[model samples]
Target: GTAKGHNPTEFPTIYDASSAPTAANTTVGIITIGGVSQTLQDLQQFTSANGLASVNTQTIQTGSSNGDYSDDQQGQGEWDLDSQSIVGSAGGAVQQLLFYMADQSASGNTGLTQAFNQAVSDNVAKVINVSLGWCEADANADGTLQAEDRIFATAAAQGQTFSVSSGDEGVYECNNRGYPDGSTYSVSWPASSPNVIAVGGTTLYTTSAGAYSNETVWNEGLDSNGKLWATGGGYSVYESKPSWQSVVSGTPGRRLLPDISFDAAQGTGALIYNYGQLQQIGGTSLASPIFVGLWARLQSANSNSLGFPAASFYSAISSTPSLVHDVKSGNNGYGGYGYNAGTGWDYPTGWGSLDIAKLSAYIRSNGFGH
Candidate 1:
């Protein structure tokens, strides 16, 4: 399959969520690891220009508010991508977006953990989106992984679901940190945390009328530094497989990633309105919020909590196979250690992308809500 130019506007159409109930009464929470400088002016312009005026957005600062916003285009870009993608994908459905911003100085897992805690503590949003993560090695070394897993466990128990980006480093999940050259296996944390929905990336093929075509694992290969970069996937290094994934074969004991995937290839990326310009954005970052928005819509229709979706999703796949598109091709391997997308669940794409209408019906049929 080849890349097609699809903007955020076409996402609801391509994903078949346009006619589904809007997240009108729902509030979606987003946790930002570093400080973001997305001004209301910028967001207003974006919403106005993109036909997303119904989106209710707000920002909540947890730690110190003295974080730098200048010369931090990376942070700014992430903020824009997260916020816009949710609003765009959910269309006029989302009622409010609570942005939990943490200071950059609160680096490592401290900031992220704090942000997550705040989101769960508030008990407002049923769905939370996390677009940031660290390699398993760093997270384990600093005890960040343990802290986050504890928090995620609490969230799961409280009926709050989290969607996290698996990563964009293919199977070389830790390659960005300049690990030893011979290292072949690595996967991101939090996404590997079992309690959260680990969202992976995919290259989507769509027609001009927003019809579903096909998709494959998103793997773009090496970066400028000669390091590998693609959709991150593999088994968890520490966490055990949740009961929800018990039916998934091949990987036993260890938790497999990417509960679901979305269009994350730069070739078929979302059009993000940032700092007065429209930039195409990809990566699992884009994938996470797209699922978040879809989740919001599901919550809205359900009129109650959907809780952790992995189990429900897996059940739906087994009974109502039409709810998901099983990705049966592509691989997230760089130098040969990653897994492949088979006819069923695999590391790269999980049970594949969602068919919102069918999924919504499935959830309702399962007595989730309405």
Candidate 2:
């Protein structure tokens, strides 16, 4: 039928930021825990050759209390995926990429707490990509959901941005790893937090010139190793809708996500050289870092003054609407439990994706939102 897969080089054209960042050497932060290899070499070499600087010796640990989590294979692969997407030609080719090895404590927020605090008190990267989260109930029952929200709130006030992967299990968020049907539906924590930008996923299609073609809610359906895989999005069970959040229903809504989406389909993935080969990486995990990469560019353009973008984005959509390539079709549902994509902001894909070039311009004209 149609060609499949997205290329990294096509990124600059896809988002219409041919000049990409319009600024160089902006910082980016990625939070990876126990499973990350942290020894991947091709990551730096590839980004470096593509005009992006590599951050060497910048990995930090949240604490000595390493939780019961370790995965060299999965961690390395995932780390490579998120890492490359953030610095790949498409992500922003940024410099000074920092890694915070978060502690995967049972509480889930302890490691993030340390890393987030360190991000504010110790670094210049206002944009942090968080691809990790527990199901809302998991964090809530553990008593860490509110604690994590506090950290996110503090970062928001400091003008920091956290691009979080909303989830990959469609509406089956409580079962991100796998879902069979159950009211266990809920958005993931942190992404559900109003303080962060909940990044969903998309199935990207690019033109011959590497330009934007179209996108659909990333739904691989039982295609992902026989598991239910799709972009996870929905309403928060605990968080009240932030003044920044909106729904097409337009009456009153609880906090909804994802605030945005990017390519997350393995069939149409970002090319990253890892595992001794070029691996096509896709997931909402990839989407989050892509936002981080793009946001850092927006920051580089505006002196890094555009604070957290969720509120600004909602406002932008209300005023212009053209700044984003709103996904008008597709759904992240299965077994009749997922959300559908619609004309405006819907559960599957929030206000949809960004037209970074125009978004950058808007920021230049208006400055950061409170």
Candidate 3:
């Protein structure tokens, strides 16, 4: 519903990560589950405001010609949330390439893979954000892994970044049916891909000025049917771990998702005007855009030279201690099938929320890469 406290200065208020050095061209591309409503974007031209509808330029959309089923409103609201959240965390100068993927499963994911591959091939936006995904097993069964993984790897090498939502269903990501038993353990695809940044969720408490005070794993507990609304996390069996993770303690050969986390508790989430009303929302959905826009900010400040960031995260973990605020509480498991949030990197929250200024400074001084 309603967000009570917000710093609202752009670059994100919950973590006080807004006032860092900003750049003019933090262009971002939001791959939406459906198309974004124009009301969610600024119709104004050439004005870099740091608020919602912040795209100084008119926000662009795809499938306007043939209709990417953007007419489908089933998910357009959340797509709006995705766009609004991006504006909340980045300046109005920010632009978006709204590639509409009409479904949330195989058909839709197939579209997503193609759209993003084209986006990367065209160099449309170096930074992309997607708040949607399929569970690991489902995608594999759908045969989405082979092509999707290849695009991600190419996206990474092309010096592009895809910040993906880890998921909002806790460890039982695949348990989206009638009643969740927590019997199944799964992580979101694209997010679980080591080539991308998996953004988890957190319940953030801010001070009067909207600066970070404390955070915990975003766990709203379970619903009547045993549905968990917590941050999704865990290790991926199918995806192989990368060299960037060589130093993490107890690092498994399997990919450990949620390379990072952010404020995703709806109560402490981003406030946006959706369709007709202003509502607050959260989930790893909100978390990914926060990182997406903020990373774009970092990218702009650094002349957009930063490539894929897994290695940089590991480097920051080793040498730059304060760049990341290590999350140290909460657990994301259900039916005894999850991981706890401990100091340093863990499943629920990765290197934790970012200290934007510190990270920007690091990137500025050292350039990019470890």
Candidate 4:
């Protein structure tokens, strides 16, 4: 029989947060582009199934409502996967979830910008998750890159943090778009933006008891028919390297991603409830929310917002090796300009995944948390 997707309990052990403390009275914001219509019944069932009874949720619509709804399988599945992934990882710690639905038809990224700004202006949640992104080339061409960066700067200044997926197109960030030759080395936008934390992907393995196991860069190639899937990563052509990223010794002076990674391979995907059906979901989409939930827990523990955590994160990694599990294997390239996983930070897995218990202790002890 095929292996089923992992439940919430499985993540706790993998991320090393099982013995760590839970969140308390924290609000997390989820910004979904294209649209979302996740219902209370769906969330209720998910929470009940995942042991997240304290998770309360609300949805807010922005811009023109011209996209898919809950009954739409593709849209519903995306929303459900994003929402459940966050709540499940919170482990009954997060108290509230504010979902922001943006219009998909707003040319370029106007709708996404509006939704993100609204979340920051509301200031209800210090941490936000965005599972949607575009290739850097496309975003630059459409002129949404600069516009979105301005909004992200505002959010950072307001003590808000956003987790955005690097992408799921592997190193071929522009693969979805028709390229003359089907080969391009690019990174995803918003993720490549200097202001946000770019969450990447990994292939995970676990024991039957849900204990911590091993993980590698997520890069599953084509079937006989030429289908391709992998985590997105590369250096940014538009954005300059942030000061916090100096710890890693490599590449041009431009911004390189992702900042962190999580289990996002289809083979080891997270299980989600969509409408009444069970589905296994993967993608950097799953990676971003998992990080967002962990960030919420950190915020609750600190009793204050940990805005733009890159600086603190890099500092910790530079100072101690025990804070994270540095994935030193695998490659995401499709025999092209892609990079490989290495001992320290690499394009595929970033600083690698978290060992939440160790990270939590380090944060508190180092005064980054309360």
Ranking by TM-score: 1, 4, 2, 3
TM-score of each: 0.93, 0.90, 0.88, 0.92
| Candidate 2 per-residue C-alpha lDDT over 126-219 given as tens digits, one digit per residue, 9 for 90 to 100 | 7888888768888899788877788788888888888899888777767645574654567787789989899998888877666678988898
Tell me which of candidates 3 and 4 scores higher on lDDT: 4
The global C-alpha lDDT for each of the candidates, from Candidate 1 onward, is: 0.78, 0.74, 0.70, 0.77
- Which residue pairs in candidate 3 collide? 11-89, 54-92
Clashes per candidate, residues 3 or more apart or on different chains: 2, 0, 2, 0
- Better candidate number, 1 or 4, judged by lDDT: 1
Q: Write the per-residue lDDT of candidate 1 for residues 1-370, one digit (tens) a residue.
A: 3477666667788888988887776888888755455534556777788666656777776665665323256677787788878877876557788888766676655766778888888888888889888788888998888887888888888888899998887777777642324547778988898788899998999865568889888887776777655787888878888877888866769888888999888878888767777888899999998998888877887784666667777767866678788888888876665678888888888888899988877666675511
Writing each residue's lDDT as its tens digit, candidate 4 over 222-303 gives 5455545778788898899988788887577989899989989878898888877777888889988888877777787777
Model 4 TM-score, all chains together: 0.92
Clashing pairs in 4: none
Residues forming the 10-long window of minimal summed lDDT in candidate 4:
175-184
**lDDT tens digits by residue: candidate 3, 236-273:** 87988887777676877988888889888887876655
